[PDB]
Amino acid sequence: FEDSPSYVKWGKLRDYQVRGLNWLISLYENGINGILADEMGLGKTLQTISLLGYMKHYRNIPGPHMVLVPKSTLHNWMSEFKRWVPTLRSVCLIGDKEQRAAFVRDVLLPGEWDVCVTSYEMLIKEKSVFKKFNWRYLVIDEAHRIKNEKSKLSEIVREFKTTNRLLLTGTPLQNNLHELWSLLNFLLPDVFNSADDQKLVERLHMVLRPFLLRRIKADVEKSLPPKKEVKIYVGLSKMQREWYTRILMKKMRLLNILMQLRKCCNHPYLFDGAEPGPPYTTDMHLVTNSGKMVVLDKLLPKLKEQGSRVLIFSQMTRVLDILEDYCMWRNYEYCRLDGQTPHDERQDSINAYNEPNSTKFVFMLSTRAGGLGINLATADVVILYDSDWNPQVDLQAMDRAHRIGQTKTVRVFRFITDNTVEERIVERAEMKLRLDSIVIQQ
Amino acid sequence: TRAKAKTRSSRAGLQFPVGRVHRLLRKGNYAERVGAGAPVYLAAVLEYLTAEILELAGNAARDNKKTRIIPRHLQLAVRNDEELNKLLGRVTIAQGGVLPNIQSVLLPK
Amino acid sequence: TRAKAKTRSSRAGLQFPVGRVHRLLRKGNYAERVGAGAPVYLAAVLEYLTAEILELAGNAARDNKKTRIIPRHLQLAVRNDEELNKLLGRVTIAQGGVLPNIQSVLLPK
Amino acid sequence: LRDNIQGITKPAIRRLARRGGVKRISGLIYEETRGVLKVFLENVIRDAVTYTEHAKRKTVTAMDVVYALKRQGRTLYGFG
Amino acid sequence: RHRKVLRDNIQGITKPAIRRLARRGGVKRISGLIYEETRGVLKVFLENVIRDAVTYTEHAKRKTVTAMDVVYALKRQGRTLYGFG
Amino acid sequence: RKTRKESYAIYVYKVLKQVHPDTGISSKAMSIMNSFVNDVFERIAGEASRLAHYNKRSTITSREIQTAVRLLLPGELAKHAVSEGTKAVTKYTSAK
Amino acid sequence: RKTRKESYAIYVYKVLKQVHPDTGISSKAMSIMNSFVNDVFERIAGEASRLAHYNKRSTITSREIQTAVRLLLPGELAKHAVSEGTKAVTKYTSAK
Amino acid sequence: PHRYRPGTVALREIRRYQKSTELLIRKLPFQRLVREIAQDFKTDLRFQSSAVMALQEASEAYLVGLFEDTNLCAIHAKRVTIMPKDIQLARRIRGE
Amino acid sequence: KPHRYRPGTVALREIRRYQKSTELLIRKLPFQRLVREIAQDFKTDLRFQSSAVMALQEASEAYLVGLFEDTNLCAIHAKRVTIMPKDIQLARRIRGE
DNA sequence: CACAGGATGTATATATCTGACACGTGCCTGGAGACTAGGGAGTAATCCCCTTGGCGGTTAAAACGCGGGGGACAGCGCGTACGTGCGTTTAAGCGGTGCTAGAGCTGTCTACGACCAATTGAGCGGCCTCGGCACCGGGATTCTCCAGGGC
DNA sequence: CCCTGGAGAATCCCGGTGCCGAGGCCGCTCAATTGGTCGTAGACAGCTCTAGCACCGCTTAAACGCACGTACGCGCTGTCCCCCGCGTTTTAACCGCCAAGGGGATTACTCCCTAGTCTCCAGGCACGTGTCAGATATATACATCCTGTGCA
Ligand SMILES: Nc1ncnc2c1ncn2[C@@H]1O[C@H](COP(=O)(O)OP(=O)(O)O)[C@@H](O)[C@H]1O
């Protein structure tokens, strides 16, 4: 099927989505369940909509279909459903006890619907009702949620009786081959059992080529100039050395040695008693006794004398609070995004930062907050204060700014404290990135 | 030959482990020498007390429309009986609750 | 031959019998074995408690202008000290009387 | 042997109350005090006689009384 | 330097919780001063029990307090607890 | 194969089946019953040991158990338990 | 012939003469002090034996005695008693 | 004719009795009471004098403590006179 | 105009409801935080089993319920219906604390 | 002041579901059978002490009655603090990541400290005896309470 | 008026008695010293599984805060009866003494009970496993309370 079907409304499918649809059709005809990994920004939802519309239209086989999406994407999925292919009938399940009961008794039992869109929490709550019916296609968006066994969602989703299955994700491999095996075992319980060049690489490619489709965003637009990764090493200050040595040797309660060396590489003031006395001043005390703060204080004014518009991704909200104090001291306007920021406050902050003429300079983001949204295309510089164990999580934080709207190349500064646990962390991240590249990219 | 072994519990007609009671008495540092009738007597007394408390607990469970004994039923049985209340006066039963008891002055009238 | 006998009490610098304490521990059915330092530790503790009680009783008796300590003085000393009172809270001293207290609401207006 | 509880007399109850530190006494408290003393003594004497019967003796001793009081939680110092 | 405290842990024992305990106890009306006294008595009781349990755990040369240690401490205090050992 | 833990659960279950045939018990209730049996055992054994010490004897006998039962149990329970123990001892010493 | 009765009387008298040199004591107070010493001995020894049973060890040691003293005596009394006992143990080890 | 107001003699007797340390119950009536109570359990019982004296000491101490608690209850109820309901409340809170 | 119960009907209803149940009335995580904070003073780097905090909560709740029963008895003795710190202190004094 | 009706809380059946109880199986370790040795206690007999019974004289203490004041108890008013219902807010509870060491548990080896036995001599308990503290009585002082200028 | 004067109670200072605490003496039994042994606990090593620490997302019950009105706590009065102080008579405690016998305390002897060993085997653990009893929800039907209303 080299052309878009007739049920599509408001737009013709392009080459990548039509060939993805052909791949999905071939996979269904042969009778296997697969993973679509076209990366965020290649119309995976549009491909799924085209697949379901084709299933309803071309063959007279409409039936109970379940689309599992994160709660933050239910509205967008339903809007796309009602805007692209209105012929299919869709419902969404959300709300507290009374609303859920009303909705199920209204629509789910009579079953005039064909496709249902539900979240993970609603699936756990409503396993009793969602279990009874037969599902001919189970679509799961952001499949990295069920990447781990012994998890309740993965157990419940395996418990369902489905004829076919289909996974949607961007990063199937993050930490090990065990999670890829978990996804493949959910898809094909019999085909993939047990445990998972000549002894590697080639065997993986041959086995996984018919069960996967990965597309790098390079053959579609041929734009968005590539990144520039610069690693900045810091020899942290004397108080940092003193605390690091004290923690390494060993009256304060201290249990997680690794997560004490972590923040110790971030800022000593996080510990109790490292701060000075009851003056509690906030002027040049923090900058001097933290090497990363020194480098940041030297670097940001240069960016401001130039393009500015920097993004700072950090792994601790306490560190973000210290950075907020520093920005206030430097008389820098900013905006802070965090897990504690209410959802209404998040969107207006994003829009204010991304407005055509904003005075806001520094945007502080915790790396694991939000997700798959936040189009900070107008941003210029990405600065990672800390790096986590997931290179793909770091890369996602990097590509939040790296979006189709950006016109100039972006630079990513990664801060590393030598002879600390930061070296191990970055080594692990690089090794995992290499493994993912050698397995999937080719 | 060797005659068939018979448990001392079977010999006394009890349902409690006379041999285990003797072993615990000897290993508990109560005296250096233990008589033969002491474990039998102690097992009989323990069996009687267990029988009493379980009689009351089953009675309290039956009229609550249940077939299982739960700590609530055990607490209800231990209370409402004078002698067992004296025996277990300073004992806290987990997940037992308290008896229904409202003072007369607090009643509305 | 053997050297002149030297008491364990004098070896530890105590006034209470380490040997008698050791014998009582062995014959008291507390454990199969008893270590060497346990009698010394226990004798020291007993000596300290006796010394504290006797010092308080002697101070009280000197307040009363006597030389011999009596049960009244012992009761006064025990009940006028918070920690000793807590230790001996559930003990009755024969012929000791009670501490003189009168509730302030009973005093003349 | 009867009526002997009335030997515990009103002046004696008043003396005990004064040592306790009470000022005014109601007239109905004497009967209750006699009852309380009766139950206390009955418990103690029951335990003491049980110790005596175990000892295969016909004489109750201060040691028996002290052991009974101790196992009732009311240790006594001064009699052994 | 920017941090703040949330609330004292004795205040985590809330007024509605104390009122529920009083309702189980059989109490109809409660003064507004009862909550501080209840917190104080709870604190004293917990301190005694936890001190004895820590003494037992130290004697065992362990670094984890155990339900058996709590039961032993309660038995020493005179509050035998059935259901944990 | 964890190390063996001893409990009176099976004997409690047999007594329960004798007393109430069609009835059961939960896990927490069985834990409570085991604790009750252990506590009663400790009380009786301690009192018997102290009786033997007071009488200056190194043997714990059925007489000590009987006197401990009288001292610890409240009245009607004491006399019924004494009857039960006497019955059991007579059966044991008359059979074998 | 009659038997002999043991007591702590001479040791109490020695401690009294060490503390208050010219202060005497009567028979009733002597009996009270003897009973007090016996009661403290019983409490501490029982606690140590229970500790040994809980930890499944057959010996009563200075560590167990120290733990029992911490469990029994309140506060300052406990600290000073522990100091005295440790001092005695050190002297006995050194001078043996 | 001099006459003290109703209550000064009560405070005088309170002071003198809290300062004294002798027994406040007649010994022969107490002995008759003890023997009469003991006749119910076992007959042909003989007592040592020390046994009766110890019983009297314990009984007097128990009654003194009970009366102190009763006085506290009467003060709580805004009264100076002690009453049987005060005694009952004290016993109920003590646990008897 | 809206329906309203008299001051004391809901109290008796709650008394019956909580004398019917066997649950734990204190909040689990706040109680755990209190226990950890108290243990900090006695020794640092202490760990608690999850059963230890449960047993502590059970004992504490039982003790508080008994204390409230005695407190209510004292309040009734004082010709009152409301319990007060005076009643709590009297109960503790008579019980020996 | 009864009563009826309305609003709300609560008991009652009935159907669904799930995880925990009750069962079964296999193995092993702890109890039973048989036997022998040694000392703890049962038994008989003797001694002497300590309990009981009685009697008489002294005197303190109890029982009885009387008169008066103060404290308990019922009633009345008030104004305040707590219960009740509603609306907002928060954090508890549940479900996830992410590598970690850490702490408890079990198995083995090996040395030293506690037991056990023989010998001995020196603390220690019992018995006399004597002088100084406590007791008791008596006389000369301060303190305090109660009536009256309504002293 | 609050502030003297009696009057009783407590306090202090001396002097004679009594008995009980302190010291000294004898014999004997228990504790110290030595030597030999072995099993108990310490030391170490390997393994597994909970547990702690810093975060995200979501849901929802419970906590918090507020305003109103109503029982209720608390103070103040009046009354009357019940308790207390005091004097008088009566009773039984208290002390001392004597007399008798039961019973506790001791000793010597003997046996029968219990401890200790070696086999032997079955009862009692742990580990799987499935099915039913209790929990939950839901819609009923029923019981309790409260207020307006003829009584006024
Ligand atoms: N109708 C469309 N056709 C092709 N590309 C689109 C379309 N709509 C959006 N995109 C591109 O896709 C990117 C985000 O993709 P995504 O939102 O994952 O698509 P979908 O929601 O269809 O899966 C945006 O940057 C946008 O440029």
Residue numbers in the entry:
A (entry chain W): 168 to 363, 377 to 430, 443 to 634
B (entry chain G), C (entry chain C): 10 to 118
D (entry chain F): 22 to 101
E (entry chain B): 17 to 101
F (entry chain H), G (entry chain D): 27 to 122
H (entry chain E): 38 to 133
I (entry chain A): 37 to 133
Quote the passages of the study that discuss this structure, keeping the authors' original sentences.
All known remodeler enzymes use an Snf2-type ATPase motor to slide nucleosomal DNA around the histone octamer, but the precise underlying mechanism is unclear. Here, we use cryo-electron microscopy (cryo-EM) to visualize the continuous motion of nucleosomal DNA induced by human chromatin remodeler SNF2H, an ISWI family member. We merged the datasets from all conditions and performed extensive data analyses to determine 13 unique structures of the active SNF2H bound to the nucleosome. Based on the conformations of DNA at SHL2 and of SNF2H, we clustered our 13 structures into five groups (A to E).
In group C (guide strand movement, 30% of A-D particles), the direction of SNF2H movement changes compared to group B structures: SNF2H rotates downward and outward, away from the histone octamer, while the brace helix continues its outward movement. SNF2H adopts the canonical open conformation observed in group B, and moves as a rigid body relative to the nucleosome. These movements gradually pull the guide strand of DNA outward at SHL3 and correct the distortion at SHL2 and SHL3 seen in group B structures, while preserving the interactions between SNF2H residues and DNA. The DNA rearrangements in group C structures relieve most of the histone distortions seen in group B structures, though some distortions remain, since the DNA is still pulled away from the histone octamer surface compared to the canonical nucleosome. Conformational changes in SNF2H induced by ATP hydrolysis pull the nucleosomal DNA at SHL2 in two steps (from A to B and from B to C structures), resulting in the formation of a DNA bulge that accommodates one additional base pair at SHL2. The majority of our particles (75%) belong to groups B and C, indicating that the enzyme spends most of its time in those states.
